[PDB]
Amino acid sequence: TTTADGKPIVTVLVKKNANQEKMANMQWAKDLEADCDCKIEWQEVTREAWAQQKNATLASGDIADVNLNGYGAVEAYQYPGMFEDLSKDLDKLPNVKAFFKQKPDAKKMSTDSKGRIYAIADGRGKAYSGTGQHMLINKAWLDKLGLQVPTTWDELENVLKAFKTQDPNGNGQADEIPMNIKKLEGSYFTWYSPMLLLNSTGIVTGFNKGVSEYGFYAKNGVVKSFLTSDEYKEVIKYYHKLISEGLIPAEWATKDDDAYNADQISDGKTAKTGVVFGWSPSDNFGKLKDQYIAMPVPSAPGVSPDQTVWDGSSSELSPAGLSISSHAANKDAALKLANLLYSEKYSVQQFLGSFGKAITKTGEHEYTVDNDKLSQLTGDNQYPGLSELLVGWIPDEATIKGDTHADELIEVNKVYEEQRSHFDPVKDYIPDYVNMDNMDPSDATKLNTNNAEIFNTTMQKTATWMSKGGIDEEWDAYCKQLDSIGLQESTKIWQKWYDTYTK
Numbered sequence: 001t002t003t004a005d006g007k008p009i010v011t012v013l014v015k016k017n018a019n020q021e022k023m024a025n026m027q028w029a030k031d032l033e034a035d036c037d038c039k040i041e042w043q044e045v046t047r048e049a050w051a052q053q054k055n056a057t058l059a060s061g062d063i064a065d066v067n068l069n070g071y072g073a074v075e076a077y078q079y080p081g082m083f084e085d086l087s088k089d090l091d092k093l094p095n096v097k098a099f100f101k102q103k104p105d106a107k108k109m110s111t112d113s114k115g116r117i118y119a120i121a122d123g124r125g126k127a128y129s130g131t132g133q134h135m136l137i138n139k140a141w142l143d144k145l146g147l148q149v150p151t152t153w154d155e156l157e158n159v160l161k162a163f164k165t166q167d168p169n170g171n172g173q174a175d176e177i178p179m180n181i182k183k184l185e186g187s188y189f190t191w192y193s194p195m196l197l198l199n200s201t202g203i204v205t206g207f208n209k210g211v212s213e214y215g216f217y218a219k220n221g222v223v224k225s226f227l228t229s230d231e232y233k234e235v236i237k238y239y240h241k242l243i244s245e246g247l248i249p250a251e252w253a254t255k256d257d258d259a260y261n262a263d264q265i266s267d268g269k270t271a272k273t274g275v276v277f278g279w280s281p282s283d284n285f286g287k288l289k290d291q292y293i294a295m296p297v298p299s300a301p302g303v304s305p306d307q308t309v310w311d312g313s314s315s316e317l318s319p320a321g322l323s324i325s326s327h328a329a330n331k332d333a334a335l336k337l338a339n340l341l342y343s344e345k346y347s348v349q350q351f352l353g354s355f356g357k358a359i360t361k362t363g364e365h366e367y368t369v370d371n372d373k374l375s376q377l378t379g380d381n382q383y384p385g386l387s388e389l390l391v392g393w394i395p396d397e398a399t400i401k402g403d404t405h406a407d408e409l410i411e412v413n414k415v416y417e418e419q420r421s422h423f424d425p426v427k428d429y430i431p432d433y434v435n436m437d438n439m440d441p442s443d444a445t446k447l448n449t450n451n452a453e454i455f456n457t458t459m460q461k462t463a464t465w466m467s468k469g470g471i472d473e474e475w476d477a478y479c480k481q482l483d484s485i486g487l488q489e490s491t492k493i494w495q496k497w498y499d500t501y502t503k
């Protein structure tokens with residue numbers, strides 16, 4: 001557990017994206033080792049490789065000293081005595097204390113109801129504080145056709161019929177896809193889900209992560225499932241009207257993500273798609289980006305602009321970034337390494353790569369990204385850091401120039417500030433620190449068991465209703481069936497955890 005020079009050896013498991021450079025080639029990782037005065041043995045695992053390797057490792061009983069995006073806190077309860085309770089070590093983690101002070105939601109994410117800290121959250125910076133979900137529309141097409149951004153479901157339908165029939169890309173072909181939507185996944189609502197139209201009805205979604213991807217929401221302090229809501233039924237009928245009218249592709253429900261995205265990107269010369277949910281004009285439309293803007297979501301019938309909401313997610317904080325083995329050979333070195341990961345120097349470098357590579361430090365808290373370089377490195381599968389898999393935090397005092405992914409986010413998020421102000425982030429949104437990873441293992445187990453029954457046929461039935469109709473007839477039996485297999489139990493369990501963390 002010790003070098004020849006007597007430096008402590010620290011094993012560190014680290015989850016990676018496939019497009020990333022190896023830890024051994026990252027200068028910041030060597031700097032970190034030198035600052036810690038230890039030897040780091042990196043164990044690099046991709047998102048997909050880890051999914052197979054994980055439970056085998058916990059069953060094994062043999063975990064790395066420091067673990068980056070390896071485990072969540074509930075696992076410390078599933079395998080007693082495996083993980084260090086970091087709440088007893090905060091004096092050795094001044095950078096973590098600083099993180100908790102500036103971002104109290106990260107403290108709450110990191111601390112369970114017993115006050116223990118088994119897995120510390122991470123943050124990507126205030127530039128990512130808004131939602132990752134947006135609704136994008138071809139503004140050039142609207143201009144060309146002499147139409148306004150629609151503000152109701154009826155106006156939206158009229159705009160889509162105009163996209164369908166008036167050839168707004170000018171090529172003479174009836175090739176326009178008025179609105180394109182992602183297929184449903186079997187077990188959760190996805191990023192950019194067509195169910196983002198729930199916000200039209202006054203129900204706040206949070207599809208970046210957490211509870212609302214299983215169909216839960218809150219209003220006035222009471223947790224509900226939208227799976228059995230009139231609102232969910234109205235969204236599905238509205239989609240059926242659109243699909244039935246040829247305004248969304250017939251084959252949407254079976255179309256793979258790659259083909260779906262290629263629809264929007266087209267050939268980079270002729271725009272094909274009028275409306276999608278997505279990140280940004282640039283991310284979703286590439287070279288065609290100048291034709292597109294983000295729009296506020298249209299209101300559903302009976303729903304006032306004041307009552308119309310937008311997705312309540314934040315892209316900044318992420319739970320379960322850092323965990324430390326209770327059996328760490330060199331515990332003090334482990335803590336020293338973890339504290340350094342949460343310093344600005346190493347948090348920024350984890351995020352955007354080593355200084356001098358694709359990012360330069362221009363001041364004490366100021367950095368400039370060289371975008372050509374970052375894109376080239378990414379293309380070559382040599383991204384110089386951990387990017388969104390950073391375990392650390394970008395402090396508010398840091399100003400980063402040239403993070404295009406952040407800059408585009410900032411611009412589209414301006415569009416949603418009004419609608420997002422229309423809900424209470426506590427009473428009308430189940431906060432991100434209320435998640436299955438912050439519960440008793442017995443409660444998590446119930447929720448997972450129920451989820452397998454709830455999402456046995458729900459997405460399939462939802463897709464079929466959207467495509468083929470028939471919801472009115474089948475709705476009552478569908479709801480009773482969901483309630484009979486544990487939906488109301490799940491709702492009650494989420495209510496309890498919501499109240500524990502919130503009330």
Ligand SMILES: [Mg+2]
Binds near residue numbers: 168170173175176
């Ligand atoms: Mg055309």
